[PDB]
A and B are shown apart, each in its own frame.
Chain A
């Protein structure tokens, strides 16, 4: 328990705890022992695994290992059969190499998915001061910050960053920025007073790396290094178990299916091989061939190419991914946990409401002024707008007139900055208007007066009066007024108006907004002449019984595209949870504005107020919404946090610490959610790491948030989440089409070897030719299924159940392998026998023919006609067999890719040609085919023969059969949803 308690200790106790002095500091020596006991006051960088060793495990894993074993056999075979001088089997060298290239090239495809690989703690050390002023042996001097130790007496002034976690003993007008703790850059006061239970809210703790905005303070170093609040946040960021993304899970699933089935098929036939009389070394080679046939050597690569073409699409909408796995996850997301400030909101205090003419008006708070405006025909409004405009000391920096008023940079406080932009947006030019009414006196806002005041010459040449204008806290502005502007007239402030005021004021307060009152008073020349000497310290002017003009309230408003983006996600079955460091009342107001809380939803505290019944008795179930604060959360059991997550579907978590965000994220994860986190602040990085996908705002985002995130929104447009959900759902549906297409041809790569082994017909399909199919002719068409549009209205579907709806499940596989793959295999053998018989070898003579076929001492083998054949001539006819089996598969892959366009829709409904990239892929397939066949030289290089036109036609009835067969299957399931035909033969 390293939780700070030193805010609750007296000076006596603190001196005893640290063996220190609250005015003289630690002894020089003890600070040097303490330095050697605790180590540097610095954040320890955990080095992630070395870049080279991460590349290594990209060479392991199910398929990679089978390839390794296969190349191993090819090397051994190339060894054994060169240790006895047989030069023909240099195929088994080339075979090993090509496989090794495939292993290595695949290993790169899994490694160059990770674009950034930047350290997270690089950004945290960057928030840490290099220097500090310490007091040791009553000598104040400037030291390196990393030399500080618990007990040290430290001085802080405004402008410098706080050099450790510090218990404040003395402070003069000191304020800090705690955004890295709370996400909020509102300045917090630091005193030596213990103002709260938690050291995160007490005024007399200041935190390492926080900016001291103003003032001076002294205090006792209470934690250093990784024990500081910022060290703990950084620990939680870097030291998070690096879990697999939803798609990585899915990929390793089907790899473990395939690597198992490959091992089954290889090993059972190795036994069959030896059982039927082959030598051990020859069975060992069959095992290599079977694994080469059955394993899809180019599959992983096609998958990362498909992800890449989604990443490219996302990027074109200013949504940037750091690893291609992340290009999927929003598709599978079921809970979004969102930061409020600077994520859902603009992190910009903005005029939200106005009370005047006894009515509350709503100002347009959008950044692009795309909203609904308020009524400005009032003369009461013209007066209130004159007050909030003249009684302002902020100013726009020079020459930003090409900048939108929201974006412009103002010299002033957040409040005055808000009122000024509001002015510039309702009037023509606030600073110019202001200059037309020259200021002749002023009291800036002060702690004693509790208001701000100025008196002004009037623009009109004819009118010589001076106008007093004043702003401040509403009650305190009201207690100095005697009249009020209502609907063109001025009315004495009776009890009904004072009560009307109080209602409006507390109402705007209930919307989580900050309120100011605004009053005016026209001074007559008769008492104040045109040159009257308005002395501030004299207070010649009255300062009482003024005319109240109105209330103005301000809030950190939603970004404009955020409320619709949030409805979209919910419409997509995604739960949305607010998780904010800000105060609950404001959090609930923004949650409601943004649609996290729907109109009508009630908290248990809401219901309790309506029924005027205490909260103990409200039925918890009856409240759709819930607001839990950090303190309440720290009080709950986890059985209670899940009970609240289940009970109230519209959930707001306010005033949460960074660890508390991560705890909420993982609470949803333990329940089965795939969780996304959207944030921007240092305080969000732990939750950002722990989410299955972390999205950071590109502009508002802090480096820690961006570096912890897996995706960046370069334009800050939250609606890009909606795009991501869609593209993620598309890629998953399209990946299973691509994968299904790639797998199905593994079976007619395999069965030729099974027949070759167990029937001893001459080898129908060689390893080199298989690679050409797996790695070249079929790669473009599988990738073009990436561009398949959605069959259904995907953005109205629930998010997928990650336990039951997998990328590749038994229906997809069995159908692909043992139905369509079998049709292809039959086609292949049909062409093989056709090409053999038309060349002299009748089917019955191929059975058992392999030994004489493959015999270099046999130069006169007789065919079915009695013709005599050399090994050479036989070898070429073997190649002609390879080639005729190769085109049987290619032809069927045309049908195949067409039936993989749609899993449920007919091809006649959505058409065969809507996907244009696919047809280019189909055409490129046939070309590289013809090249391999009919480029001269090919027979002696890649064992490809220029086949006769008839042997292209032979397998087309099978392809047409593949189209017709799937076309009817898909018809059957549209026409019969609940039937057996769907439940078993839909994939």
Chain B
């Protein structure tokens, strides 16, 4: 008898598992009730999503941040960059975009009923060719070979978030530290003016827009000096987008180290 008799060893066990079943049962029911208060289309609260994050492809990380470095002379130092850039643009082929439709409105695309197939809302196409020179055609190297590389700037999507309708939200890239000897960062954006069209908003969530695709803007850096370390900051200029958070450097902004070796 290992601390009590073996008949009492059993009636204790039964109680504890019964207790544990009831409690488990009670908990399971709480989660079920919870999943009925929950709307499958719109989150109850978006406390941590007041402003959208920003990200950039190709995303290569060094220590404590985004760090990108290649050699124009050795095409194999940028092979992977172009490759993940190409591989990323795959979901933006015209074929991958068959689920979403043309948007010409250049205004917010409000859908309150589900007219798209299988009881969904429509989403707007965005095809790789909208990035033009930085689409992989006719330059499959995305501007890396010529030392004027394209970086793709994507905005995190948030259900029902409206960025501001006085104009389209734009991207702007400049040097973090503008070199005293240097000129400003000279950049050409695709589409023109680095804008995301208004139609792509609001996002209605993965269940309402399963084929939704984030619009993109490519930043073709024309200025950047060879064999030097620089830092580029790309900010989203929109009425409802902020980029001042010191505890989230990816809020409304994205920064990266760059060095183009020769």
Known: A85-B63, A840-B46. A833 touches B34 (CB 8 A): yes
Q: Which residues of B contact A870 (CB under 8 A)?
A: 53, 156, 248, 250-251
Interface centre among B34, B212, B245 (most CB of A within 10 A): B34
Q: Mark B245-258, 1 if CB is under 8 A from A, else 0.
A: 10111110000000
Whether A826 lies near B27 (C-beta < 8 A) is yes
- Tell me the smallest distance from the CB of A711 to a CB of chain B, in Å: 38
Residues of A near B64 (CB, < 8 A) are 85, 87
Task: For A913, list chain B residues within 8 Å (CB).
Answer: none
- From known contacts A840-B43, A866-B206, infer whether A860 and B154 are also in contact, taking CB-CB under 8 Å: yes
The segment from A344-352, A499-507, A872-880 that touches chain B is A872-880
With contacts A862-B206, A865-B159 taken as known, whether A980 is within 8 angstroms of B49 at the C-beta atoms is no
Bound together, the chains give a CA A865 to CA B161 distance in angstroms of 13
Does A948 belong to the interface (CB within 8 Å)? yes
| Docked pose: A810 CA to B42 CA in angstroms | 49
Least Cβ–Cβ distance between B109 and chain A, in angstroms: 16
Contact of A872 among B41, B44, B157, B245 (CB under 8 A): B245
A818 at the interface (CB under 8 A from B): yes
Interface residue ranges of A868-895 to B (CB < 8 Å): 868-874, 876-877, 880
17 A-B pairs with CB atoms under 8 Å apart are A810-B3, A830-B27, A865-B159, A866-B203, A866-B206, A866-B207, A866-B212, A867-B43, A867-B205, A868-B53, A868-B157, A869-B53, A871-B250, A872-B53, A872-B251, A873-B248, A877-B48
C-alpha gap A87/B44 in the complex (Å): 34
Are the C-beta atoms of A876 and B34 separated by less than 8 Å?
A: no
A826-B26, A980-B11 are contacts. A869–B49 as well, Cβ < 8 Å? yes
**1/0 contact string of A801-826 vs chain B (CB within 8 Å):** 00000000010000000110011001
Residues of chain B in range 172-208 having any CB-CB distance to chain A below 8 Å: 203, 205-207
Residues of chain A within 8 A of B212, CB atoms compared: 866
Give the CA-CA distance A876 to B53 in the complex, in Å.
Answer: 14
Give the shortest distance, in Å, between A217 (CB) and chain B (any CB).
69
Chain B residues with Cβ below 8 Å from A822 are 19-20, 23
Does A838 lie at the interface of the complex (its beta carbon under 8 Å from any beta carbon of B)? Answer: yes
Residues of chain B from 90 to 136 with CB closer than 8 A to chain A in the complex? none
Residues in A whose Cβ lies below 8 Å from that of B27: 826, 829-830
Once bound together, how far apart are the Cα atoms of A877 and B53, in whole Å? Answer: 15
Give the number of chain A interface residues (Cβ < 8 Å): 41
Q: Could you say which residues of chain B place their CB within 8 Å of the CB of A984? A: 8, 12
In the bound complex, residues from chain B placing their C-beta under 8 Å from that of A818 are 16
Report whether A860 and B156 are in contact in the complex, using a CB–CB cutoff of 8 Å: yes
User: Min CB distance, B92 to chain A, in Å?
Assistant: 15
Q: Name the residue in B26, B46, B47 with the highest tally of chain A Cβ atoms < 10 Å from its Cβ.
A: B47
Task: State which residues 66-87 of A face B: CB under 8 Å.
Answer: 85, 87
- CB neighbours (8 Å) of A842 from chain B are 35, 38
Q: Is the CB–CB distance between B53 and A838 below 8 Å?
A: no
Identify the B interface with A (CB < 8 A). 3, 8, 11-12, 16, 19-20, 23-24, 26-27, 30-31, 34-35, 38, 41-49, 52-55, 59, 61, 63-64, 154, 156-159, 203, 205-207, 212, 214, 245, 247-251
Q: Is the CB of B206 within 8 A of A868?
A: no
B45–A865 CB distance below 8 A: no
Q: B31 contacts which chain A residues (CB < 8 A)?
A: 830, 833, 843
The interface residues of chain B lying within 8 Å CB-to-CB of A868 are 52-53, 156-158, 214
A958 to B54, CA, bound (A): 41
CB distance from B128 to the nearest CB of A (A): 19
A316 at the interface (CB under 8 A from B): no
Q: Which residue on A lies nearest to B214, using beta carbons?
A: A868
CB of A561 to closest CB in B, whole Å: 47
Residue of chain A at shortest CB distance from B51: A873
Q: Closest Cβ of chain A: how far from B208's Cβ, in Å? A: 9
CA distance A833 to B34 in the complex (A): 9
Task: Contact check, B156 vs A839: say whether CB atoms are below 8 A apart.
Answer: no
- Closest Cβ of chain A to B126, distance in Å, is 15
Tell me whether B157 and A837 are in contact (CB under 8 A).
Answer: no
Contact: B47 with A880, CB < 8 Å? Answer: yes
A947: min CB distance to chain B, Å: 10
Q: Is A593 an interface residue (CB 8 A)?
A: no
Q: Are B156 and A837 in contact, CB atoms less than 8 angstroms apart?
A: no
Q: Which residues in A have some Cβ–Cβ distance to B below 8 Å?
A: 85, 87, 810, 818-819, 822-823, 826, 829-830, 833-834, 837-840, 842-843, 856-857, 859-860, 862-863, 865-874, 876-877, 880, 940, 948, 980, 984
Using known A-B contacts A839-B48, A872-B245, determine if residue A859 contacts B157 with beta carbons closer than 8 Å. Answer: no
Are B156's CB and A867's CB within 8 A?
yes
Shortest distance from the beta carbon of B160 to any chain A beta carbon, whole Å? 10
**By the criterion CB–CB under 8 Å, are B35 and A867 in contact?**
no
Number of A-B contacts (CB under 8 A): 120
Q: CA–CA, A829 to B248, complex, Å?
A: 28
Q: In the bound complex, how far is the Cα of B64 from the Cα of A85, in angstroms?
A: 8
> Which chain B residues lie closer than 8 Å to A873 at the CB level?
48-49, 53, 248
Min CB gap A363→B, angstroms: 63
Query: Which A residues are in CB contact (< 8 Å) with B250?
Result: 859, 870-872
| A867 close to B49 (CB less than 8 A) | yes
Give the docked Cα–Cα distance between A876 and B50 (Å). Answer: 12
Query: How many angstroms between the C-alpha atoms of A819 and B23 in the bound complex?
Result: 10
In the bound assembly, the distance between CA atoms of A819 and B20 in angstroms comes to 8
- Do B23 and A839 touch across chains, with their CB atoms under 8 A apart? no
Instruction: Tell which of B47, B55, B63 touches A860, judged by Cβ atoms closer than 8 Å.
Output: B55
Cα distance, A829 to B30, chains bound together (Å): 10
* A324, B259: Cα distance in complex, Å: 69
Q: Which of B38, B157, B251 contacts A867 (CB 8 A)?
A: B157
A837 touches B248 (CB 8 A): no
Which of A872, A940, A948 has most B Cβ within 10 Å?
A872
Q: How far is the CA of A85 from the CA of B45 in the complex (A)?
A: 36
CB-CB < 8 A to A874: which residues of B? 48
Q: A859 is contacted by which of B12, B19, B38, B53 (Cβ under 8 Å)? A: B53
Question: Which chain A residues lie closer than 8 Å to B247 at the CB level?
Answer: 872, 940
List 6 tightest A-B contacts by C-beta distance, closest first: A866-B206, A872-B248, A868-B156, A870-B53, A838-B44, A865-B205
Interface centre among A838, A868, A869, A940 (most CB of B within 10 A): A868
Q: How far is the CB of B123 from chain A (nearest CB, A)?
A: 11
Residues of A within 8 A of B47 (CB): 839, 877, 880
Find the B residue at minimum CB distance from A818: B16
Contact partner of A837 (CB less than 8 A), chosen from B19, B35, B42, B53, is B35
A838 and B43 within 8 A (CB) = yes
State the Cβ distance, B223 to closest chain A Cβ, in Å.
26
Complex Cα distance A869/B43, Å?
13
Whether B43 pairs with A865 at a CB distance below 8 angstroms is yes
Nearest Cβ distance between residue B16 and chain A, in whole angstroms? 7
Give A496 Cβ to nearest chain B Cβ, in Å: 77
Nearest to A863 among chain B residues (CB) is B43
Which residues of A lie under 8 Å from residue B154 when comparing CB positions?
860
Residues on B with beta carbons closer than 8 Å to the beta carbon of A940: 247
In the complex formed, the residue of A with least CB distance to B20 is A822
Known: A87-B64, A826-B27, A830-B27. A948 touches B49 (CB 8 A): no
Contacts of A867 in B (CB 8 A): 43, 46, 49, 156-159, 203, 205
Cross-chain contact A837 with B11 (CB below 8 angstroms): no
Identity of the chain B residue whose Cβ is nearest the Cβ of A87 in the assembled complex: B64
Report the minimum CB–CB distance from B248 to chain A (whole Å).
Answer: 3
Residues of B within 8 A of A877 (CB): 47-48
Looking at the assembled complex, report how far the CB atom of A90 sits from the nearest CB atom of chain B, in whole angstroms.
14
> What chain B residues lie within 8 Å of A830 (beta carbons)?
27, 30-31
* Shortest distance between the CB of A823 and any CB in chain B (Å): 7
- What separation, in Å, do the CA atoms of A880 and B48 have in the docked complex? 10
Is there contact, CB below 8 Å, between A869 and B156? yes
**What CA separation (Å) do A873 and B247 show in the bound complex?**
9
A948–B53 CA distance with the chains assembled, in angstroms: 24
Chain A residues, Cβ within 8 Å of B30: 830, 834
Chain A residues within 8 Å of B214, by CB: 868
Which chain B residue has the least Cβ–Cβ distance from A948?
B45
> Residue on A with the closest CB to B41?
A865
B71 to chain A, nearest CB (A): 23
